[PDB]
Symmetry: C2
Subunit: 146 residues, 2 copies
């Protein structure tokens, strides 16, 4: 089984063009570099668990998840959720090259795409709430199935 | 490129354990048999487009989509949406073995899983609204990453 290991990096990034639910939770699969993004109203332990529930259905269950020391990732709640799934978890510093670099690069790529696509449709500022989901799904498609 | 063609089958199926948004839109990738499911409040042209927007981000853009003659799939709206993406579309009869059998089998598998999982958590009837998303994502994971 010489193929690659199954480890992700996850963080939150603020995108006001997607308000009211302007917090994007972004996951990078470090082996393949596939990106899963979901949209959230607030950053909480539960918004992190919901996102990972989506990412699992999209990429399959990983062996480990690399995050920073954000409370939504260190809460007893989340720790329990991860243990319930059997996914090892490893923290880091906000910006720990070690295990936050890939996903920081990915936040930037994702925001760029969102802007380029939003402006092509004539949305200079905020994206109409009813357009946001299809537009976010198209930015994900682009960055993955490029 | 002797590997398989990229064609999907899509339909809607009613699941009251997921009310208020009890309409599940289900897509089968006929080659790999991967399943994408989303949750909807009503079956309309727009709910079909939203679901396919999600499926594209998950499976990539297909060449063709097999559906029945449901209006939400034959509306001028949807026809436009599909053309905008360049996805050929082919209709059928509600239950046309030709191109509705795979996805009918999949509705049944999905409802079974939802029931088995819901009852394991102690939900005999309706699933608490706040549990529905993670539970639907876990039923998808199971049926795909089995």
């Amino acid at each position: 089984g010489l193929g690659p290991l199954q480890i992700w990096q996850t963080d939150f990034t603020l995108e006001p063009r997607m308000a009211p639910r302007s917090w994007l939770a972004v996951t990078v699969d470090t082996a393949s570099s596939a990106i899963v993004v979901t949209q959230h109203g607030r950053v909480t332990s539960v918004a992190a668990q919901h996102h990972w529930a989506t990412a699992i259905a999209v990429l399959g269950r990983p062996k480990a998840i690399k995050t920073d020391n954000g409370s939504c990732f260190t809460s007893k709640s989340t720790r329990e959720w991860l243990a319930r799934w059997g996914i090892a978890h490893t923290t880091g510093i906000p910006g720990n090259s070690q295990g936050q670099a890939m996903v920081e690069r990915a936040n930037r790529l994702l925001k760029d795409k969102i802007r380029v696509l939003a402006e092509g449709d004539g949305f200079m500022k905020r994206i109409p709430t009813s357009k946001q989901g299809e537009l976010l799904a198209k930015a994900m498609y682009a960055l993955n199935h490029f």
